[PDB]
């Protein structure tokens with residue numbers, strides 16, 4: 055997260071860190087047994103870390119749970135990043151409490167101008183490398199379709215939205231992939247891709263979660 059602020063311990067109780075000997079991607083808890091993340095975050099042998107603040111210190115509220123099953127969306131295209139969403143089932147149910155909580159799925163799509171909260175443990179430098187140990191937060195608006203497609207000609211599908219600032223300086227970045235974009239208490243997006251981080255006229259690109267609710271609900275119910 056570039057140009058954001060320190061969230062504060064367990065303020066984003068739905069935020070998950072995916073670990074495979076180290077933190078590699080963010081995720082969102084949608085229920086006591088399931089996590090939503092980005093398909094580009096797929097890896098074998100994932101450990102789901104809940105209730106985390108500092109990813110390098112055991113602070114007392116963490117739940118470490120192995121993944122039992124991983125499901126990448128059937129139409130995921132690694133080349134275009136179209137349909138960048140995957141579902142992760144936990145070996146055992148997480149205990150929901152004040153610090154570990156689930157985020158609900160949208161009943162409808164958010165419109166441009168809606169303010170959202172983007173969170174993660176990714177790079178904090180525009181051009182440099184500095185990884186935080188604590189969860190970073192960023193309030194950002196959904197941008198208009200037209201300004202998104204203007205920034206990335208022929209790359210934006212109906213399954214993606216842009217969020218951030220065209221002036222640059224504040225965006226998501228490497229390490230935040232698969233992380234949540236929450237607008238008016240519902241998971242509206244997943245950190246997917248972009249061109250560099252916080253560059254002018256190059257905002258973040260997010261998977262448009264409202265397009266996958268049916269797929270998510272049906273998949274979870276049958277697994």
Ligand SMILES: Nc1nc2ccccc2[nH]1
Nearest residue numbers: 226227228247248250258
């Ligand atoms: N804005 C932005 N967000 C990103 C997330 C992962 C990789 C590159 C990125 N650029």
Ligand SMILES: [Ca+2]
Nearest residue numbers: 108111112113
């Ligand atoms: Ca910790």
